[PDB]
Amino acid sequence: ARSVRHIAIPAHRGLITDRNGEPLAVSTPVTTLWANPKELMTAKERWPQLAAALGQDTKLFADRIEQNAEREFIYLVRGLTPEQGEGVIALKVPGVYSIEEFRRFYPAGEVVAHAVGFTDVDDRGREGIELAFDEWLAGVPGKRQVLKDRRGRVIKDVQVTKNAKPGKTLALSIDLRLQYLAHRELRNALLENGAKAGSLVIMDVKTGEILAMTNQPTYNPNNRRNLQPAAMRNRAMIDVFEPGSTVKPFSMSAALASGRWKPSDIVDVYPGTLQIGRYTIRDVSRNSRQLDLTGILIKSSNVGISKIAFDIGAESIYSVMQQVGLGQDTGLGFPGERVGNLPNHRKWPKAETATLAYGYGLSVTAIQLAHAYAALANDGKSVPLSMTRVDRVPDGVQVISPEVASTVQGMLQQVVEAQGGVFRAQVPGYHAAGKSGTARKNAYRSLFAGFAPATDPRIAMVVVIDEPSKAGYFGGLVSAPVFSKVMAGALRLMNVPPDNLP
Numbered sequence: 001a002r003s004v005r006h007i008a009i010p011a012h013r014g015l016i017t018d019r020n021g022e023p024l025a026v027s028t029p030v031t032t033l034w035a036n037p038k039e040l041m042t043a044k045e046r047w048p049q050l051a052a053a054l055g056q057d058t059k060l061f062a063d064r065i066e067q068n069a070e071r072e073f074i075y076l077v078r079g080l081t082p083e084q085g086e087g088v089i090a091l092k093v094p095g096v097y098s099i100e101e102f103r104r105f106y107p108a109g110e111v112v113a114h115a116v117g118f119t120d121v122d123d124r125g126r127e128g129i130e131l132a133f134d135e136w137l138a139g140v141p142g143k144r145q146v147l148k149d150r151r152g153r154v155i156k157d158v159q160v161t162k163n164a165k166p167g168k169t170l171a172l173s174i175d176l177r178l179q180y181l182a183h184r185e186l187r188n189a190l191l192e193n194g195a196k197a198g199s200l201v202i203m204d205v206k207t208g209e210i211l212a213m214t215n216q217p218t219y220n221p222n223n224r225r226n227l228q229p230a231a232m233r234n235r236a237m238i239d240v241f242e243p244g245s246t247v248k249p250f251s252m253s254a255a256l257a258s259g260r261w262k263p264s265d266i267v268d269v270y271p272g273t274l275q276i277g278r279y280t281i282r283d284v285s286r287n288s289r290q291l292d293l294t295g296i297l298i299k300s301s302n303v304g305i306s307k308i309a310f311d312i313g314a315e316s317i318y319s320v321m322q323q324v325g326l327g328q329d330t331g332l333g334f335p336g337e338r339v340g341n342l343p344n345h346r347k348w349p350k351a352e353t354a355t356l357a358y359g360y361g362l363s364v365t366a367i368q369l370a371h372a373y374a375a376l377a378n379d380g381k382s383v384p385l386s387m388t389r390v391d392r393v394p395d396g397v398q399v400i401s402p403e404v405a406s407t408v409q410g411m412l413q414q415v416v417e418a419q420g421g422v423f424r425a426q427v428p429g430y431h432a433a434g435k436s437g438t439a440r441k442n443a444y445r446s447l448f449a450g451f452a453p454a455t456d457p458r459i460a461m462v463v464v465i466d467e468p469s470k471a472g473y474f475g476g477l478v479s480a481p482v483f484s485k486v487m488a489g490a491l492r493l494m495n496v497p498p499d500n501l502p
């Protein structure tokens, strides 16, 4: 006859912005149309006009109502624009009611899809920052009393028992200007090399802020109809890999901290191979005998780093990679975020000791690698990672001694600047530093990791490109130029003064 019931007042989801207030995810009013079927069933002459307005076949529409005749609630359509919800309401069909809902719009679309993420049908986080800060963004549903007749018809609008609590604004650490650049250059690099995937992370070495995170492939999160799982993967945070030679700078920090090695020390890498039981450590270029520690990094000698590893022990190298966060929790609390793995031993056999030293048998992500490189560039101090704007920087942890970190920084500027090094990584007007890699996954993963300006580091960057299909596949040929192009732009967009001066 008369029953009081309660309907949910859905809340506004919080505005996401970039670090400078550029909107990245904006809650847009939509209209969900619902029908009371037992009510519809006394205005059957209206159904054809409604079916046609909802773009439905007349008999399919009528069978639907006639099927659910005993029900008092069916959805007609969720999430129409107001201008098409209202056009249906305008037919005045007895028992057709409307709900002002919210649906997300992403003004930057595919450029920042993986980082900002995606909302499900109920407007809840499903991916990236939407899933991570879902509780902060979500607000809380309101609650409204409704007097209902014995047919399921709304007798009245009684009195809201609770108010909708709207979710809060979130400013990302991401700089849309650097994100756009990182997106564009990584996309050009994929198509130019005919590669399958790629990731590029830009970090602030002083604050722990992620300034850009892009992956190929990506997707338009405004196109809800054809989600392909592959193109929605935030590769930077969920796709693990062996970092290969890009961990050699950590093996070297272990060596310089041991008390057993200085940069002017020599290793004999003749004849470019080294047998270790039934495994052969192999150098790409094999016309070397004596190399200085700096030369081992410039030539990327696997034998060279392996010999240093046999002398200092795997434990010292494991402990550096552990301290800088390789295969360790990032703390970022993105669900489904993979941590990869750092293998441990009580007794390190010779083979595992060598492969660790040149980055095999560990699995890391592009965000971990960028974070280790940020700790090296910021004088051996690791600042906690952040995907939201940092106004008050937390205390960092000293993970490599400042003198060792400074010495490895210099060796990495020679890797970029010296005869025979990775010249494609050179950032005109600046001193740049870092290290190439190329991992057998014949198909390859092309890596460059570094930071700039060398004289006072501000930015760390990782570029990873999976299976370039042109003739050049070395990280130094494929990823270095991307790091170069994006670094030139990123430093200039940050008004970092060019440091290649007298």
Ligand SMILES: *C(=O)[C@@H](NC(=O)[C@H](C(=O)O)c1ccsc1)[C@@H]1N[C@@H](C(=O)O)C(C)(C)S1
Binding pocket: 243, 244, 245, 246, 282, 284, 299, 300, 302, 358, 436, 437, 438, 439, 440, 474, 475, 476
């Ligand atoms: C480090 O990544 C290391 N790569 C290799 O040794 C690869 C392997 O495991 O055999 C390799 C060798 C030729 S293609 C892949 C050295 N660093 C690389 C780099 O700096 O790009 C290298 C290709 C110079 S060898």
Ligand SMILES: [Ca+2]
Binding pocket: 377, 378, 379, 455, 456, 457
């Ligand atoms: Ca410094």
